[PDB]
Design a protein around this ligand. Sequence first.
Ligand SMILES: OC[C@H]1O[C@@H]2O[C@H]3[C@H](O)[C@@H](O)[C@@H](O[C@H]4[C@H](O)[C@@H](O)[C@@H](O[C@H]5[C@H](O)[C@@H](O)[C@@H](O[C@H]6[C@H](O)[C@@H](O)[C@@H](O[C@H]7[C@H](O)[C@@H](O)[C@@H](O[C@H]8[C@H](O)[C@@H](O)[C@@H](O[C@H]1[C@H](O)[C@H]2O)O[C@@H]8CO)O[C@@H]7CO)O[C@@H]6CO)O[C@@H]5CO)O[C@@H]4CO)O[C@@H]3CO
Ligand code: HEM
Ligand code: V2H
Length: 465
Amino acid sequence: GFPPGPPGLPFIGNIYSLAASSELPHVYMRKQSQVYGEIFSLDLGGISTVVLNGYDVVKECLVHQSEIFADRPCLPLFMKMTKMGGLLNSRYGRGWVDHRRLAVNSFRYFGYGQKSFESKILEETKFFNDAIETYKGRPFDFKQLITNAVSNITNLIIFGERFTYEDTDFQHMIELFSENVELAASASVFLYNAFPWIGILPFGKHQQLFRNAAVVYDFLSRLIEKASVNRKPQLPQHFVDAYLDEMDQGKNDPSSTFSKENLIFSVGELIIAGTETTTNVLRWAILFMALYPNIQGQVQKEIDLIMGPNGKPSWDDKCKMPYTEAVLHEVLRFCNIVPLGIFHATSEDAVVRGYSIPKGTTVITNLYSVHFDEKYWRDPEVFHPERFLDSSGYFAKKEALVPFSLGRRHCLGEHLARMEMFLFFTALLQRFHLHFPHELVPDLKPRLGMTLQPQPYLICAERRH
Ligand SMILES: OC[C@H]1O[C@@H]2O[C@H]3[C@H](O)[C@@H](O)[C@@H](O[C@H]4[C@H](O)[C@@H](O)[C@@H](O[C@H]5[C@H](O)[C@@H](O)[C@@H](O[C@H]6[C@H](O)[C@@H](O)[C@@H](O[C@H]7[C@H](O)[C@@H](O)[C@@H](O[C@H]8[C@H](O)[C@@H](O)[C@@H](O[C@H]1[C@H](O)[C@H]2O)O[C@@H]8CO)O[C@@H]7CO)O[C@@H]6CO)O[C@@H]5CO)O[C@@H]4CO)O[C@@H]3CO
Ligand code: HEM
Ligand SMILES: C=C1/C(=C\C=C2/CCC[C@]3(C)[C@@H]([C@H](C)/C=C/[C@H](C)C(C)C)CC[C@@H]23)C[C@@H](O)C[C@@H]1O
């Protein structure tokens, strides 16, 4: 019948287990799969949940049974925030198809599908690097500038413009939205979802999340208004105009799923999905380059060979730069920015590997455990870019690397993110040498959150040529 799993206390189930563990949840779950198998279950305060561990079981569900596992779970928090509409936490259905299709098309059309786009990224690297230079090699935290820079790339697509690094109102909105992605992972919210009557309690991380969500919702709708002011119907300049075009064409269809609400939800989802994740990839990579300068320098050696010490980075250089691509893939594999993906749910009663999974069960894809699957990786616990190089020195793509997930819900911003990653990384490492202050001992244990990010750390960036 249902998959087995560790026991915990009545009422709260394995919320106790996760909470009581020294380990972060994805690590905890991986360890439990060594006892209970690749597919096991957790009881999260009475919400029944199955966890998928290792590459084979994750592929078997999200790919072989893609429609069955394409859904999102109706956790109280998700219902409150977005009523299971929008895009990211939309239920699998027509609503999702509509918003997904529009986003995919918008990102090609207003983004990388256009000849001029790559240089808009490069402009952002100049703004970014220039900002870094202003510190004149003195130690500082990159978090804010990186966030500014990365978020601007999607701002171009969604709003048709970048915002300046003085726009603290926008920055403040992103700051609250990040807290929410972090708080989504807390015991407090796992309990809230189990016992939603906890909403009566005025104190705690759940009230912080709802308060934040309110402030974020208002701001985003105000931006969306400002973005639609000069709109020329059926000639859109960005995703917002495109969305409004859609609402116009579905005016007489009552079952049309586009709405002012769903526009705010899907815009917010697109903004935070891009900013949280890519920012953190770069923050992890910078951390590791400062920690392992022989790797940093080998990357820089390739930049100098292929880009020259002075030439403008190009996406087209990627395939002349396998060691650089290797480092970046190894950051993704090792640091696991989205360790447990986004939770799925079964759109119907499912049977997988003999076990039954009733419709609506939360299904956690432990992407961490895929990246550490010893069937497919040698010494996964070791940071070693070289694992991605083949015997001729070229980058070798591995099927068991899935940091953007698989199946119907796979990251929709994958291609854009890879361009940003590559171009920001090379632009930065071409212009600066990075190292820690007083060579201070930095912390590599990630913070608990729906994404993994490093603790605050200072860096010195010193010009090179
Ligand atoms: O005031 C009497 C109060 O009695 C009952 O509440 C008890 C509660 O059930 C217990 O859990 C415990 O509370 C402790 C709590 O568990 C700790 O977490 C803590 O608080 C920290 C929080 O963790 C942290 O989040 C933050 O708190 C901030 C809030 O998150 C934030 O939302 C805001 O709070 C303000 C609210 O916006 C607003 O509701 C208003 O509060 C009034 C309530 O509306 C009203 O119901 C009543 O509260 C009763 C309650 O009904 C019982 O269940 O009066 C409140 C006015 O005093 O104003 C809030 C205050 O600004 O801002 C806070 C900023 O702190 O930080 C704290 C740091 O400690 O400590 C608690 C220790 O008591 O006990 C309480 C009763 O003591
Ligand atoms: C390093 C960069 C990124 C990483 C590691 C990452 C990671 C992920 C992961 C793990 C998922 C889970 C999919 C699932 O199993 O349901 C996902 C989906 C998603 N991502 Fe990303 N992401 C990145 C960049 C982006 C960017 C740049 C955007 C938007 C600009 C974005 C927007 C989304 C959205 C909207 C979904 C949900 C898609 C759906 O529900 O169909 N992500 N991403
Ligand atoms: C969609 C929106 C809202 C909330 C969005 C949230 C709040 C809870 C946590 C969510 C659902 C995140 C979940 C946990 C997914 C996070 C993945 C890992 C991302 C960061 C890659 C994404 C949007 C977050 C309501 C409101 O604030 C407007 C905003 O547009």
